[PDB]
């Protein structure tokens, strides 16, 4: 995740519960990567309090 965070793009990186730099040191199970396309108004549309 060091290459993903320190990328050429990916301008939005809303990382919670762990820092972007700590994540690339942790180990997990059943990690899920979801993907979808939305319109430009994406800002704060993914928050848990959204």
């Amino acid at each position: 995740y060091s290459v993903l965070y320190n990328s050429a793009s990916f301008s939005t990186f809303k990382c919670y519960g762990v820092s972007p730099t700590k994540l690339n040191d942790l180990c997990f199970t059943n990690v899920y990567a979801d993907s979808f396309v939305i319109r430009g108004d994406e800002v704060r549309q993914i928050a848990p309090g959204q």
Partner: protein
């Protein structure tokens, strides 16, 4: 009992340069959790440590 108020730039490792976006410039954060007369953690509890 140490205090740090230098207000520098949190180089995120993204690049060894001076800037704001992608640099996490400004150690404190302006969005103080005041949520006036509502929510939880609306800045109650003035603290004195003896």
């Amino acid at each position: 009992f140490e205090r740090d108020i230098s207000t520098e730039i949190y180089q995120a490792g993204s690049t060894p340069c001076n800037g704001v976006k992608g640099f996490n410039c400004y150690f404190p954060l302006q969005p103080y959790g005041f949520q006036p007369t509502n929510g939880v953690g609306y800045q109650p509890y003035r603290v004195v440590v003896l």
